[PDB]
């Protein structure tokens, strides 16, 4: 196993030249520096570690280093350089896995003054250097101040323009931090046993003799990096074709909403000063004094003035128009600013910045696009589809396949409660109408009330919120929950074993529950440490971890089987991963025939995961074929 | 009419002579299925069909043009396609090692003509006959086609022998009549559908008998088609 980190001229989007790179080999216990005229030998040294059957350690390698050296080897040396996933390790990925929390631990490091506040909780290489005591300085700062003591000014992102011996020295500096952070991650005896040097071993022994979560996260991070490079095709004209229908409506409404109110329907310090003059008495306030002015209360605001009352719905539309504009046409997001020259949006994704499960998406958040049930969402969802590019060569309309996890949340509960009811509740899922059973069990009037109950009750809603479902308060809530526990004993006993797994005894002392903690981490499905939580609720943490870890393995096995079936991944191939959303995925497909294979494969892949972890409940998927996202869901 | 052919005889014959170097590895890939899929992975071809046209051309001594024209090129593209397949399938390379060096002592080029010192200018067939070749640069094509032709020859003999032994009479006046033998497939006339069904089963029974007879390392199978004519039997 060798440890490295590289230095290029810019990001992966427009990287042109390779500057330097250092390779520390543990068998020789000595570093090796590479220069612009040594890029060829650098690629050979990495291939040699692959030929021996070892491993290559990069920081942010799955997302940057490895794909950039594939791109850089194509334009500079014109060679096919491709690192296999199995022979690659990303310290950044393990850091987010092993140190998913840090929130706690970083507090003392912050109190110590050993961590910059700008580098709080960051998994960046420099952020970890201060944590381990290996930061002698940063290349960006020893460059800025040294440009002063030389003359020339500074450009926001110019320290990577040209190769200099100080970068070569700080390139080594990034490797020794990568090395020390790697060893800091290998010293956690819950993911890596106390065997031997896990550097000394080959990749075949590495993945299997390590905790399973280690392997999944590197397969997930490798897979998601491909999806970002694939990107999600974007119809610029269509979204532009939305802005006037919103902006003209915004301008026309603003005119009408200034004739009703003389001398901005967008701020809370505005309407509070205005609406409290038309006779509206705020019922619910906020923890800072100001009254609540959300969608809920506005629907119920009643004023004697007919014009003011009718103007409320015009404010309701205004805020929503601003919302769509504020998501589709604003500044520094808006999708329209993120459209790359290939007509696609490359939305980034953090493998699992959320302790339990489900990645985080940003620049732009591809997971918060308005659904087809929300206003103007039909047009918005239509703007996302594989139909925006009809094949990279053949001109063949690419069709989209959208596959989601059928009621994954409730099925995860049946598996963990199958420990107390012997597959009873799991069979009620298969029999169908689990919301009908929960309705009978909790004695609710309508099935829809049971649907919003089972999720609310499971996820820690108070007795008022439960009572407010049927139009009541905490009175009906307590009896609605107590009745459900009696009719479904397994759920109640489930919340016992959990409450007695992380607590020894609890006690209230002047405002704080003083739990005598037995463990501050629930074991997941792969064996990982899953957050710490704090109070009585925890079941929500267990279920969302199960489903997302199911989906993570699901989307990996799906792509693995599709590749195993011969289907090439990419826009120049048969399919391309475009988006992963919670329990659903959107996959571009070159032909309808291929799209059918994707749907069937996703269902078949769902069985390996369900079989692997011996899930007591049946995992299933449903696929929808069509041009865009408004059709596939 | 009953049309029965030898299911992929060429590739299974290759598995038999290379089972001497891989201990039945490649042979099981035939039975497990999708051998053209493995050859596709081994030689790094984009489509399975490209692997099919590859395996036959490479085995029989095709240069690089037919190979290069697969990807839209010339004689240039071919060497890396052939060498990569050799690295991923050592047994095939090892197959041409011991056998091709079983017929030579040392070779020598004289004025552009290889004046190879031979051990014997003839490869032994499945029944000890002399099967000569020409150049030791390949010869494998001669070896495989010799196995296949000798397999079918015995195959059509035992099939008729078993059919006669079971009670069937040969000819237009009996129950069945051989109409044409085409290398790895045969066309047999049958008086009734019932006789044709027996013909199909017997041919498979004879094909397994041949494999046990010469202790063939790979498994031989056949497929039959019943119908009125030849367009139906194939």
Contact B22/B229 with Cβ under 8 angstroms?
A: no
For residue A279, report the phi and psi dihedrals to the nearest 5 degrees: 95, 25
Residue B178 labelled as part of a binding site: no
User: How many C-beta atoms lie closer than 10 Å to residue A330's C-beta?
Assistant: 15
Residue A558 pairs in a beta bridge with: none
Its sign, for the CA torsion B144, B147, B150, B152, is: negative
Q: Do B40 and A566 touch (CB under 8 A)?
A: yes
A630: DSSP letter: T
User: What is the Cα–Cα distance from A70 to A57, expressed in whole angstroms?
Assistant: 16
Under DSSP, the state recorded for B169 is P
Task: State whether A568 and B37 contact (CB < 8 Å).
Answer: no
Measure in Å the smallest separation between the Cα of A341 and chain B Cα atoms.
28
From A555, A571, A572, A568, select the one nearest A609 (Cα to Cα): A555
- Experimental approach was X-ray
Query: Do residues B232 and B10 touch, judged by C-beta distance below 8 A?
Result: no
DSSP A358-427: --EEESS-TT-PPPTTSTTHHHHHHTBBGGGSS-SSS----EEEEEEETTHHHHHHHHHHHHHHSSHHHH
CA distance A17 to A580: 32
For residue A523, the 8-state DSSP code is E
Q: Which residue of A has its CA nearest to B36?
A: A566
CA distance A386 to A399: 6
**On the CB side of B119, how many CA atoms lie within 13 Å of its CA?**
11
Q: Is A568 on the interface with B (CB under 8 A)?
A: yes
Q: Is the peptide bond before A364 cis (omega within 30 degrees of 0)?
A: yes
B36 is in an annotated binding site: yes
- Enter the tokens of residue A532: 């710490």
Between CA A108 and CA A102 the distance in angstroms is 10
B37 touching A, CB under 8 A?
yes
Give yes or no for A306 touching B (CB within 8 A). Answer: no
Query: A11 to each of A37, A157, A267, A339, B135, how far by Cα in Å?
Result: 21, 10, 38, 17, 57
CA distance A87 to A83: 7
In chain B, where does DSSP find H-type helix?
A: 9-22, 25-32, 35-43, 48-60, 65-68, 79-88, 90-98, 140-166, 193-213
Q: What are the C-alpha distances in Å from A164 to residues A135, A160, B71?
A: 20, 9, 44
For B40, the token pair is 């596709």
> How far does B40 lie from chain A, in Å, by closest CA?
10
Residue in B with minimal Cα distance to A572:
B46
User: How many Å apart are CA A163 and CA B192, to the nearest integer?
Assistant: 86
Gap from A157 CA to chain B (nearest CA, Å): 41
Paired residues of A401 in beta bridges: A587, A625
Which of A298, A311, A313 shows the shortest CA–CA distance to A259? A311
Alpha-carbon distance of A378 to A324, in angstroms, equals: 12
DSSP string covering A104-130, please?
HHHHHHHHHT-S-GGGSS--SHHHHHH
- Nearest CA to A4 among A61, A76, A50, A81? A61
Taking CB atoms and an 8 Å cutoff, what residues of chain A touch B48?
566
Distance between CA B57 and CA B51 in Å, rounded? Answer: 10
Counting every residue written for chain B, the total comes to 234
Q: For residue B75, give Cα distances in angstroms to A27, A519, A601, B43, B206.
A: 43, 67, 39, 17, 44
Q: How many CB atoms lie within 10 A of CB B109?
A: 9
CB A59 within 8 A of CB A27: no
Rounded CA-CA distance A403/A562 in Å is: 14
- Separation of alpha carbons A484 and A457, rounded Å: 10
Q: Is B64 annotated as a binding residue?
A: no
Chain breaks in chain B (C to N over 2.5 A) after: none
Question: How many Å lie between the alpha carbon of A502 and the closest alpha carbon of chain B?
Answer: 50
Q: Residue A613 has which token pair?
A: 């972890």
3 state SS of B146: helix
Q: Which helix (H) or strand (E) holds B4?
A: strand B2-6
Contact A225, A62 (CB under 8 A): yes
The answer to whether residues A239 and A328 touch, using CB atoms and an 8 Å cutoff, is yes
Interface contact A113, partner B, CB < 8 A: no
Residues 6 or more apart whose Cβ sits within 8 Å of residue A535: A513
Neighbours of A141 (CB within 10 A): 10
Task: Assess contact for A86 and A218: CB atoms under 8 A.
Answer: no
Non-local CB neighbours of A339 within 8 Å, separated by 6+ positions:
A234, A236, A345
Instruction: Flag if B48 and A568 touch (Cβ within 8 Å).
Output: no
Contact A236, A572 (CB under 8 A): no
Q: Report whether B184 belongs to an annotated binding site.
A: yes
> Hey, which residues 529-558 in chain A have their CB within 8 Å of chain B?
none
User: What's the rounded Cα separation, in Å, for the pair A429 and A184?
Assistant: 44
Give the Cβ contact number of residue A517 at 10 Å: 12
H or E segment to which residue A621 belongs: strand A621-626
Please state, in angstroms and rounded to a whole number, the distance separating the CA atoms of residues A204 and A54: 8
Q: After which residues is chain A broken (C to N over 2.5 A)?
A: 263
Q: Could you tell me how far CA B142 lies from the centroid of its own chain?
A: 10
Q: Specify the pairing of strand B222-226 against strand B2-6.
A: antiparallel
**Residues paired with B106 in a beta bridge:** B117
Paired strand residues for A569: A575
Nearest CA in chain A to B47: A566
Q: Is B48–A566 a contact, with Cβ atoms under 8 angstroms apart?
A: yes
- Using CB atoms within 10 Å of the CB of residue A62, give its burial: 0 to 12 exposed, 13 to 18 middle, 19+ buried: buried
Best of A563, A566, A570 to disrupt the B interface (most B CBs within 10 Å) is: A566
Inter-chain Cβ pairs, chain A and chain B, closer than 8 A: 5
Largest CA distance in chain A: 85
Long-range contact set of residues A136-142: C-beta below 8 Å, sequence gap at least 24: A136/A173, A137/A170, A137/A173, A138/A170, A139/A166, A139/A167, A139/A170, A139/A173, A142/A166, A142/A170
> Per the structure block, which two tokens stand in for A16?
């042109």
Backbone angles phi, psi at A4, to 5 degrees: -150, 170
SS3 (DSSP) at B6 = strand
Asked whether the beta carbons of A400 and A629 are under 8 A apart, the reply is yes
Structure token pair of residue A20: 């330097």
Q: Report helix, strand or coil for B52.
A: helix
Instruction: List domains and CATH numbers for chain B.
Output: 1-7+120-234 (3.30.70.370), 8-119 (1.10.150.20)
| Backbone dihedral angles phi then psi of residue A25, each to the nearest 5 degrees | -100, 130
8 Å CB contact between A92 and A81: no
Find out whether A441 and A453 touch, Cβ atoms under 8 Å.
Answer: no
Residue B176 half-sphere exposure, CB side, CA atoms within 13 Å?
Answer: 27
A41 within 8 A of A54, measured Cβ to Cβ: no
Radius of gyration of the CA atoms of chain A, in A: 28
Ligand-binding annotation for B127, yes or no, is: no
Chain B residues with CB under 8 Å of A393 CB are: none
Sign for the pseudo-dihedral over CA of B212, B215, B221, B226: negative
Contact present, A39 and A22 (Cβ < 8 Å):
no
Closest CA to A165 of A29, A7, A2, A12: A7
| Residues 6+ away with beta carbon under 8 Å from A79 | A43, A73
CB atoms within 10 A of CB A155: 9
Beta-bridge partners for A399: A589
For residue A528, the tally of other CB atoms under 10 A from its CB is 26
- How far apart CA A258 and CA A273 sit, in angstroms, is 15
Residue of B nearest to A568 (CA): B46
Please check whether residue A566 touches B, CB under 8 A. Answer: yes
- For residue B195, give the 3-state DSSP assignment: helix
CA–CA gap between residue A417 and residue A489 (Å, rounded):
10
Angstrom distance (rounded) from CA B140 to CA B47: 25
A80 in contact with B at a CB cutoff of 8 Å?
no
Following CA atoms A490, A495, A497, A500 in sequence, which dihedral angle do they give, to the nearest 10 degrees? -160
Query: Whole-angstrom Cα distance, residue B152 to residue B62?
Result: 25
- Both tokens of A534, joined, read 């704090």
Q: How far is A34 from chain B (nearest CA, A)?
A: 29
**Nearest alpha carbon to residue A297 among A263, A271, A332:** A271
Q: Among A346, A64, A67, A394, which Cα is nearest to A230's?
A: A346
The C-alpha of A81 sits at a distance from chain B's nearest C-alpha, in angstroms, of: 15
* A contact residues 589-608, partner B, Cβ 8 Å cutoff: none
Q: Shortest Cα distance from B5 to chain A (angstroms)?
A: 28
Interatomic CA distance for residues A298 and A288, integer angstroms: 20
B225 is in an annotated binding site: no
Q: How far apart are CA B224 and CA B206, in angstroms?
A: 13
Chain B residues within an 8 Å CB radius of A566:
37, 40, 47-48
- CA A354 from centroid of its chain's CA atoms: 7
Q: Does A565 lie at the interface with B, CB-CB under 8 angstroms?
A: no
- A577 DSSP assignment: E
Buried-exposed string B163-202: b where 16+ CB fall within 10 A, e elsewhere? beeeebeeeeeebbeeeeeeebbbbbbbeeeebbebbbeb
Measured distance CA(A235)–CA(A387) in Å, rounded: 9
Angle between helix A474-487 and A489-499 (nearest 10):
100
Residue B184's SS3 state is: coil
DSSP secondary structure letters along A235-303: -HHHHHHHHHHHHHHHHHHHHHHHHSS---TT-HHHHHHHHTTTT---SSB-TTSPBP-SHHHHHH---
Q: How far apart are CA A203 and CA A192, in angstroms?
A: 14
CA dist., res. A530 & res. A354, Å (int): 9
What is the residue-wise DSSP string for A357-373? Answer: S--EEESS-TT-PPPTT
User: What does chain A come to in residues?
Assistant: 633
Q: How buried is residue A551: exposed, middle or buried, by Cβ count under 10 Å (0-12/13-18/19+)?
A: buried
**Beta-sheet strands, E only, within A35-99:** 56-58, 88-90
Rounded distance between C-alpha atoms, residue A443 and residue A151, angstroms: 78
* Closest residue of chain B to A563, computed from CA coordinates: B41
**How far is Cα A416 from Cα A418, in angstroms, rounded to an integer?**
5
Distances (CA, A) of A297 to A256, A274, A300, A342: 22, 15, 5, 44
Backbone angles phi, psi at A23, to 5 degrees: -125, 110
Determine contact: B48 vs chain A, CB below 8 A. Answer: yes
CA distance B78 to chain A (A): 17
Give CA separation, B106 vs A73, A501, B94, B118, in Å. Answer: 44, 77, 18, 8
CB contact under 8 A, B40 and A568: no
| H or E segment to which residue A74 belongs | helix A66-75
* CA separation for the pair B146, B135 (Å, rounded): 16
CB A23 within 8 A of CB A55: no
* CA-wise closest residue to B56 among B157, B149, B188, B144: B144
Alpha carbons A446 and B5: distance in angstroms, whole number = 66
Q: Is A591 helix (H, G, I), strand (E, B) or coil?
A: coil
Q: Give the pairing type, strands A584-589 and A575-581.
A: antiparallel
Report yes or no: B144 and B14 within 8 Å, Cβ to Cβ.
yes
Residue B44 in contact with partner chain A when CB distance is under 8 A:
no
Q: What's the rounded Cα separation, in Å, for the pair B78 and A427?
A: 58
Task: List A628's β-bridge partners, or say none.
Answer: A385
Greatest Cα pair distance, chain B, in angstroms, is 65
CB atoms within 10 A of CB A219: 22
Residue A589's DSSP bridge partners are A399, A575
Chain A residues within an 8 Å CB radius of B46: 568
* Residue A29: how many other CB atoms lie within 10 Å: 7
């Amino acid at each position: 196993m060798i440890v490295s980190a590289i230095a290029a001229n810019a990001l992966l989007e427009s990287v042109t030249k390779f500057h330097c790179g250092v390779i520390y080999d543990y068998s020789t216990a000595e570093y090796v520096s590479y220069r612009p005229s040594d890029f060829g030998a650098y690629l050979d040294a990495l291939e040699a570690e692959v030929a021996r059957g070892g491993l290559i350690v990069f920081h942010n390698g799955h997302k940057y280093d490895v794909p950039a050296l594939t791109k850089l080897a194509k334009l500079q040396l014109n060679r096919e350089f491709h690192l296999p996933r199995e022979n690659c390790i990303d310290t950044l990925v393990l850091s987010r896995l092993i140190h998913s929390n840090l929130k706690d631990t970083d507090m003392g490091l912050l109190r110590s003054g050993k961590l910059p506040g700008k580098r709080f909780g960051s998994h960046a290489l420099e952020a970890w250097g201060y944590r381990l005591g290996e930061m002698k300085g940063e290349y960006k700062d020893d460059f800025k101040r040294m440009l002063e003591e030389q003359g020339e000014e500074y450009v926001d992102g110019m320290e990577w323009w040209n190769f200099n011996e100080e970068m070569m020295d700080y390139n080594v500096q990034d490797v020794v931090v990568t090395k020390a952070l790697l060893e800091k991650l290998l010293s956690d005896k819950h993911y890596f046993p106390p065997e031997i040097d896990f550097t000394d071993v080959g990749y075949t022994t590495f993945w299997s003799e390590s905790l399973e979560a280690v392997d999944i996260e590197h397969r997930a991070a490798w897979l998601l990096a491909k999806q970002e490079r694939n990107g999600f095709p974007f119809d610029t004209k269509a979204i532009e074709e939305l802005y006037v229908e919103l902006a003209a409506r915004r301008s026309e409404l603003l005119r009408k909403l200034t004739e009703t109110f003389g001398s901005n329907p967008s701020s809370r310090d505005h309407i509070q000063k205005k609406l409290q003059e038309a006779g509206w008495v705020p019922t619910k306030y906020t923890d800072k004094g100001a009254p609540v002015v959300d969608d809920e209360v506005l629907e119920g605001v009643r004023v004697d003035d007919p014009e003011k009352q009718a103007a409320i719905d015009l404010i309701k539309e205004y805020l929503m128009i601003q919302k769509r504009i504020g998501q589709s046409a604003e500044g520094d997001k808006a999708w329209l600013r993120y459209v790359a020259e290939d007509g696609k949006i490359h939305g980034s994704v953090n493998p699992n910045g959320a302790v339990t499960g489900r990645a985080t998406h940003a620049f732009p958040n591809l997971a918060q696009i308005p659904g087809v049930r929300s206003p103007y969402g039909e047009q918005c969802r239509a703007a996302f589809g594989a139909e925006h590019h009809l094949d990279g060569i053949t001109g063949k309309p690419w069709v989209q396949a959208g596959i989601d996890a059928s009621g994954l949340e409730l099925r995860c509960l049946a598996h963990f409660m199958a420990r107390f009811d012997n597959g009873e509740y799991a069979h009620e899922i298969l029999n169908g109408d689990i919301h009908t059973k929960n309705q009978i069990a909790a004695e609710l009037p309508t099935r829809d009330n049971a649907k919003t109950f089972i999720y609310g009750f499971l996820y820690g809603a108070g007795d008022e919120k439960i009572g407010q479902i049927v139009g009541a308060g905490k009175e009906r809530g307590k009896e609605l929950k107590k009745k459900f526990l009696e009719n479904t004993p397994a759920i109640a006993a489930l919340r016992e074993s959990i409450q007695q797994t992380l607590v020894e005894s609890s006690q209230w002392v002047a405002g704080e529950q003083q739990v005598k903690w037995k463990r501050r981490w629930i074991k997941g499905l792969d064996g990982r440490k899953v957050h710490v939580r704090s109070p009585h609720a925890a079941l929500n943490t267990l279920l969302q971890s199960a489903g997302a870890l199911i989906c993570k393995l699901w989307i990996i096995k799906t792509e693995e089987m599709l590749v195993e079936k011969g289907l090439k991944h990419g826009w120049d191939g048969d399919f391309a991963y475009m988006a992963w959303v919670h329990d659903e995925i959107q996959v571009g497909c070159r032909t309808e025939e291929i799209a059918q294979v994707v749907i069937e494969t996703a269902q078949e892949a769902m069985r390996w995961v369900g079989d692997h972890w011996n899930f007591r409940c049946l995992l299933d998927t449903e696929g929808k074929m069509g041009p865009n996202w408004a059709i596939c869901h």
